[PDB]
RNA sequence: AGGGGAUCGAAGAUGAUCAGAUACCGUCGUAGUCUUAACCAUAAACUAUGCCGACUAGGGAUCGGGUGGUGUUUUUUUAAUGACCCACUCGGCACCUUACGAGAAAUCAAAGUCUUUGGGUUCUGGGGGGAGUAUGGUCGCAAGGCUGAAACUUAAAGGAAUUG
């Protein structure tokens, strides 16, 4: 299952830490993730961001399994990563919902609203609760950019990212972006840096 | 039915408390369950100091505040504007403004 | 007494997504504009989704009014996107080649991988 | 559940959860079947494979449904180690 | 635990407190203390002759207004005296 | 204070399936719960557990798969005569194909169904399905 | 019944009333509706249409209004939509 | 009718009672 | 014409689902309804009852009336509707729908001897609502349906012969007794028992293998 | 019963208010309020939630005691204590979120681990009145407390919530 084409590289690693993706939560961090690393004074946990890589990449592959990959919802309402959600859409099929989720959209069969998707990633849990509560009104998975101190509730697979930051969620969804692809088409040639810049994401 | 789950109010690992008198009303009532809110004032009301500037000799004088500590029974609190009637769901919260 | 109802707001929007092409900030022009395009019943009709469209107009120039599309604001809008792009990709640049991290951080690398710019505090 | 005669009786056959070997049944709209796209030389997405994963609506909403997931995908495979057997 | 013993050897104080608890009950009570013999007009039987004394008209409860026509007898095997309606149409006439 | 200890086991076992665990320990373990978690083995309710030999009364770690529906103790431990455990199946068990009452007799700690066909009774310890 | 031959035959709305007695003690009160009924301002006038008549049933007479909405689109004389409506269109697909 | 009051005439007027029935021997 | 929206909706005209068992191995929501007018056709439907209930209102006295229905097969399929509104009539047709968007399979069993043909529960079971317990237990052959006749009906539409009930609460209260039935045998299906423990390759959806089966051109 | 009796103040006395107003408000003011020596034994004596034991969610504070650290100040030079900081933990007053479970609901971390009904044990309830009455017993100086019926009568009282 595992090659090491998925290796997590040098250079991939400096891209991560230049976000500070790896930096977790205060004195706050759910019981439900060991996807912490020994932490830090000052109080904050620094993530094992081989664990965030690790799931990044069964991320990719839960995606790529999703048969008309259009109907693949990707949220967010943060202010940030409105941004990057939506550059993430246009690469792969990926319905996109930045701004508002207008709740009724997965229950609540009316036009003008209303996708009916196979999965969803959001990027705050927390503050996206309506998508995920509203997912577990219909069988949809859910695909989570959990921090340290974010809700494990309804949510399927985490990837522990640093949520309260500027580069860190746009690293990620460009990182899922690029390997979402990885996986049929464009950049066919691993360990051969995507055309694509990450700090479009922003 | 049971309003609050604070029953009156605040006091949870005792029995018995002592009481207070309202200082509008007289009324005896529990320390724990008296409103309590400070006056902390100058002795000067809105303006009245730019027109007692002048007024002073002592060049360097500050201004002392006058202190008093009040505490008032839960009819009288309500019937000023000391608290209000609160919603069911907005009884629950602890920001004084 | 003078607040305009959605049938103006949202008739009077309903043009400047499909006619910014024209339109303009004088009332007048806009009036004689109407009634070829649209099927206003009254007099006093029209003359008050002009008086909103030429109001929208009349600050339009100054950032979009929320609810509004013509074919040039998302030309122009999508503009700005990429301002730091052609310029220092945020690696090794804006730092001296040095990634700066702290002593527990720094541990986490001798994990797994190795190639790395050190740092300390 | 057969009969005598061993002609096979019981309509459906519920589904189980992976975590928990729990039932699936027919209003737990809180479970979710997981596919994980299997790869193979360079990706590919081997295009409608996958391995396929259950989760009970109930372990989804413990909080347990990222967890149990890791466990279940790492013990598969598919994982490096991310998860401790031992806590 | 649920307020009552479980022990294989707390047979008596189960016993007992149904014993106990069985005189909130009201048919019971009404049977133990035998008020059908010491209170009671009719002897505890169901039937009892009597004498009618006189005639006698009660009005009915409200919201309704009418005249009930009892009369009232003085039973053979007791002296006690009690009221009795007679059922139906007329039918106080066939007493005298 | 501690009274059933078997009772205090079955109701960690119980809470713990319940909660979707798949493992539970269980203070302070003896011969006779041992003998209850074995016939819930044999007909596998259950897998492997492990006493732990502390040098007091032994703690106990039993690892569960999700068939369990219930297991619980009945208190006092009545004496049911042979005929009578058609009536107490009747109750506790969900149907007549499976699920145990399990007794303890001279004859040993077993199921209902063994006993009925070994062909023994005693005392009554609890219920498994 | 009669309240759908309206409707289909191309209608905006519809509503008819009865006032009487069938179930028959007090004040019928029954409305019996569909669609859309701008009622009211000028439109009355140029898109409602309502007649009442009495039918005199076994025991009293009952009152039937009925009001018809014509579709202003094709008044055929007059307005031939509300006040209220709007309508635009854009060119084709055009020369960059 | 409140109780504090139902009762305390239920006391006045039952003491009535027991220095009444003394009065009686 | 039906025209569905619904992937799923969409998915069953197209005739790549042909039993409403697949839709309860998945355990799909189901928002559509046509979906089961055909899936299972032979839904017989049983008006339990019609109910006025008021809402004062500064002329008093709302009266909208409120029907509760329950549909079914005598063959192991059962769903029920409780909705109101302002004529009689029109609460019953919603009724309806609404009886049949919520179908629960439930699952029938023999009493002792496994013989053919099962004709009673699967183990022990119960529901509750409101005040109402109603426990279900399996019954030998030719003892009927010993229940309430409201629910003697409703398990006639669920298709049991022999089984045993046994209330408790204000069952007089119909509306949730019936419910509390329901709960009951929407349990059926989830009831582990030993002939189920077997690891199973959990069938792959519907809504991937004709996955090409949704959206426009 | 003795001391004590500043204050407040059942009774009372009064000034008001009032249709009346020995009520509310104002001024007095006896007992009382404190105290020793005796009684009394009850309160919405309330968490209206018996005690013991076991188990089942997430989170942050706090009080006590302990453990750990090249940690800050104590600077007494560094110590060492005390104070503080961080981390653990046992025990306690509570709180937040949430229910996966409970409930008629209000709500509930127990009010959960119950018709899938049994860990141990003590007390109490069985429609509303009549009535905590009558009677017997007992305690008390008394006021009263403890124990405690029946005739009789009644189709509802009642709990939680909903809309007006
Ligand atoms: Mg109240
Ligand atoms: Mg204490
Ligand atoms: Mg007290
Ligand atoms: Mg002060
Ligand atoms: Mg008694
Ligand atoms: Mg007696
Ligand atoms: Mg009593
Ligand atoms: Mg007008
Ligand atoms: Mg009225
Ligand atoms: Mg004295
Ligand atoms: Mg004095
Ligand atoms: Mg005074
Ligand atoms: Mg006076
Ligand atoms: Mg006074
Ligand atoms: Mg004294
Ligand atoms: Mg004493
Ligand atoms: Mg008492
Ligand atoms: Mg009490
Ligand atoms: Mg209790
Ligand atoms: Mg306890
Ligand atoms: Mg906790
Ligand atoms: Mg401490
Ligand atoms: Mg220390
Ligand atoms: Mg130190
Ligand atoms: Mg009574
Ligand atoms: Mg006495
Ligand atoms: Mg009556
Ligand atoms: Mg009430
Ligand atoms: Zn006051």
Same mark, same amino acid.
């Given at each position: 299952?595992?090659?090491?084409?998925?290796?997590?590289?040098?250079?991939?690693? %400096?891209?991560?830490?230049?976000?500070?993706?790896?930096?977790? $939560?205060?004195?706050? %961090?759910?019981? %439900?993730?060991?996807?912490?690393?020994?932490?830090?004074?000052?109080?904050?946990?620094? =993530?094992?961001?081989?664990?965030?890589?690790?799931?990044?990449?069964?991320? $990719?592959?839960? =995606?790529?399994?999703?048969?008309?990959?259009?109907?693949?919802?990707?949220?967010?309402?943060?202010?940030?990563? %409105?941004?990057?959600?939506?550059?993430?859409? $246009?690469?792969?099929?990926?319905?996109?919902?930045?701004?508002?989720?207008?709740?009724?959209?997965?229950?609540?069969? =009316?036009?003008?609203?209303?996708?009916?998707?196979?999965?969803? =990633?959001?990027?705050?849990?927390?503050?996206?609760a309506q998508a995920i509560k509203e997912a577990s009104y219909v069988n949809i998975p859910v695909i989570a950019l959990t921090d340290l101190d974010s809700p494990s509730e309804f949510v399927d697979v985490a990837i522990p990212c640093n949520n309260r930051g500027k580069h860190s969620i746009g690293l990620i969804w460009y990182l899922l972006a690029r390997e979402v692809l990885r996986l049929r088409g464009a950049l066919v040639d691993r360990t051969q840096p995507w055309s694509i810049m990450p700090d479009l994401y922003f | 039915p049971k309003k609050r789950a604070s029953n009156g109010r605040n006091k949870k690992g005792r029995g018995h408390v002592k009481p207070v008198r309202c200082v509008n009303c007289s009324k005896s009532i529990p320390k724990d369950k008296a409103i309590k809110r400070m006056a902390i004032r100058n002795i000067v009301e809105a303006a009245a100091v730019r027109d007692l500037s002048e007024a002073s000799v002592y060049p360097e004088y500050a201004l002392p505040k006058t202190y008093n500590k009040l505490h008032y029974c839960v009819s009288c609190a309500i019937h000023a504007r000391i608290v209000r009637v609160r919603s069911r769901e907005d009884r629950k919260n602890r920001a004084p403004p | 007494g003078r607040v305009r109802?959605?049938?103006?707001?949202?008739?009077?929007?309903? *043009?400047?997504?499909?006619?910014?092409?024209?339109?303009?900030?004088?009332?007048?022009?806009?009036? @004689? *504009?109407?009634?070829?395009?649209?099927?206003?019943?009254?007099? @006093? *009709? @029209?003359?008050?989704?002009?008086?909103?469209?030429?109001? *929208?107009?009349?600050?339009?120039?100054?950032?979009?009014?929320?609810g509004i599309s013509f074919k040039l604001q998302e030309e122009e809008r999508e503009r700005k996107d990429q301002y730091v792009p052609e310029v220092s990709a945020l690696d090794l640049s804006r730092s001296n080649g040095v990634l700066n991290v702290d002593n527990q951080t720094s541990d986490l690398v001798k994990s797994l991988g190795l190639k790395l710019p050190l740092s300390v505090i | 559940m057969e009969n005598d005669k061993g002609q096979l009786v019981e309509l459906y056959v519920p589904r189980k959860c992976s975590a928990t070997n729990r039932i699936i049944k027919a209003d737990d709209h809180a479970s979710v079947q997981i596919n994980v796209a299997k790869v193979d030389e360079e990706g590919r997405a081997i295009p409608g494979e996958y391995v396929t994963y259950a989760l009970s609506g109930y372990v989804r909403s413990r909080g347990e449904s990222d967890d149990s997931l890791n466990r279940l995908a790492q013990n598969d495979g598919l994982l490096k180690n991310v998860w401790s057997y031992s806590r | 635990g649920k307020g009552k013993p479980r022990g294989l050897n707390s047979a008596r104080k189960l016993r007992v407190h149904r014993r106990? !608890?069985?005189?909130?009950?009201?048919?019971?009570?009404?049977?133990?203390?035998?008020?059908?013999?010491?209170?009671?007009?009719?002897? #505890?039987?169901?039937?009892?002759? #009597?004498?009618?004394? &006189?005639?006698?008209?009660? &009005?009915?409860?409200?919201? !309704?207004?009418?005249?009930?026509?009892?009369?009232?007898?003085?039973?053979?095997?007791?002296?006690?005296?009690?009221?009795?309606?007679?059922? !139906?149409? #007329?039918?106080?006439?066939?007493?005298? | 204070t501690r009274s059933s200890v078997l009772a205090d086991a079955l109701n960690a076992i119980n809470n713990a399936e319940k909660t979707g665990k798949?493992?539970?320990?269980?203070?302070?373990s003896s011969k006779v719960i041992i003998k209850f978690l074995q016939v819930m083995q044999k007909h596998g309710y259950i897998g492997e557990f492990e006493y732990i030999d502390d040098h007091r009364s032994g703690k106990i770690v039993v690892q569960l798969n999700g068939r369990l529906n219930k297991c619980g103790v009945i208190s006092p431990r009545f004496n049911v005569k042979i005929g009578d455990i058609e009536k107490w199946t009747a109750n506790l068990l969900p149907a007549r194909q499976f699920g145990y009452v399990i007794l303890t007799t001279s004859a040993g700690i077993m199921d209902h169904e063994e006993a009925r066909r070994k062909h023994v009774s005693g005392k009554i310890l609890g219920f498994v399905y | 019944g009669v309240v759908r031959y309206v409707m289909e035959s191309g209608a905006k709305g519809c509503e008819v009333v009865v006032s009487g007695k069938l179930r028959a003690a007090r004040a019928k009160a029954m409305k019996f509706a569909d669609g859309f009924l701008i009622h009211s301002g000028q439109p009355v006038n140029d898109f409602i249409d309502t007649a009442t008549r009495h039918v005199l049933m076994r025991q009293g007479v009952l009152g039937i209004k009925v009001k018809i909405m014509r579709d202003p689109a094709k008044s055929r004389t007059g307005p031939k939509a509300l006040p209220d409506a709007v309508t635009i269109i854009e060119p084709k697909e055009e020369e960059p | 009718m409140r109780a504090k009051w139902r009762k305390k005439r239920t006391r006045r007027l039952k003491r009535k009672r027991r220095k009444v029935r003394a009065r009686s021997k | 014409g039906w025209v569905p929206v619904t992937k799923l909706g969409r998915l069953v005209k197209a005739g790549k689902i042909t039993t409403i068992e697949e839709i309860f191995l998945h355990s799909l929501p189901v928002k559509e309804f046509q979906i089961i007018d055909t899936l299972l056709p032979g839904l017989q439907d049983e008006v339990m009852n019609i109910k006025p209930v008021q809402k004062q209102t500064r002329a008093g006295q709302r009266t909208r009336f409120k029907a509760v229905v329950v549909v079914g097969d005598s063959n192991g399929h059962v769903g029920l509707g409780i909705k109101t509104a302002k004529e009689v009539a029109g609460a019953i047709r919603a009724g309806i729908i609404i009886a049949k968007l919520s179908v629960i399979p439930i699952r029938r069993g023999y009493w002792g001897t496994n013989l053919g043909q099962p004709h009673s529960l699967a183990t022990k079971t119960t529901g509750k609502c409101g005040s109402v317990t109603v426990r279900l237990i399996p019954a030998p052959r030719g003892s009927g349906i010993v229940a309430s006749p409201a629910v003697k009906k409703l398990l006639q539409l669920a298709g049991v012969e022999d089984v045993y009930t046994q209330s408790n609460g204000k069952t007089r209260t119909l509306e949730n007794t019936l419910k509390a039935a329901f709960v009951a045998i929407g349990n059926t299906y989830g009831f582990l028992t030993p002939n189920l423990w077997a690891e199973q390759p959990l069938p792959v959806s519907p809504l991937d293998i004709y996955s090409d089966e949704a959206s426009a051109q």
């Open positions: 299952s595992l090659p090491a084409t998925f290796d997590l590289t040098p250079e991939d690693a %400096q891209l991560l830490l230049a976000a500070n993706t790896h930096l977790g $939560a205060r004195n706050v %961090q759910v019981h %439900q993730e060991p996807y912490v690393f020994n932490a830090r004074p000052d109080g904050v946990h620094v =993530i094992n961001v081989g664990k965030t890589w690790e799931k990044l990449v069964l991320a $990719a592959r839960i =995606i790529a399994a999703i048969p008309n990959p259009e109907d693949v919802v990707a949220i967010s309402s943060r202010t940030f990563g %409105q941004r990057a959600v939506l550059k993430f859409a $246009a690469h792969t099929g990926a319905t996109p919902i930045a701004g508002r989720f207008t709740p009724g959209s997965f229950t609540n069969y =009316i036009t003008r609203s209303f996708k009916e998707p196979r999965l969803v =990633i959001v990027t705050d849990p927390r503050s996206d | - | 109802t959605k049938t103006v707001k949202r008739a009077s929007k309903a *043009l400047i997504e499909r006619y910014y092409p024209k339109l303009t900030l004088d009332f007048q022009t806009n009036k @004689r *504009l109407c009634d070829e395009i649209a099927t206003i019943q009254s007099k @006093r *009709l @029209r003359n008050k989704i002009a008086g909103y469209t030429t109001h *929208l107009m009349k600050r339009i120039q100054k950032g979009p009014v929320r | - | 106990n !608890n069985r005189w909130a009950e009201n048919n019971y009570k009404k049977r133990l203390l035998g008020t059908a013999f010491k209170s009671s007009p009719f002897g #505890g039987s169901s039937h009892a002759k #009597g004498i009618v004394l &006189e005639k006698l008209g009660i &009005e009915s409860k409200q919201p !309704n207004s009418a005249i009930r026509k009892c009369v009232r007898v003085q039973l053979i095997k007791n002296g006690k005296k009690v009221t009795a309606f007679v059922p !139906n149409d #007329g039918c106080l006439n066939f007493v005298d | 798949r493992q539970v320990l269980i203070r302070p | - | - | -």
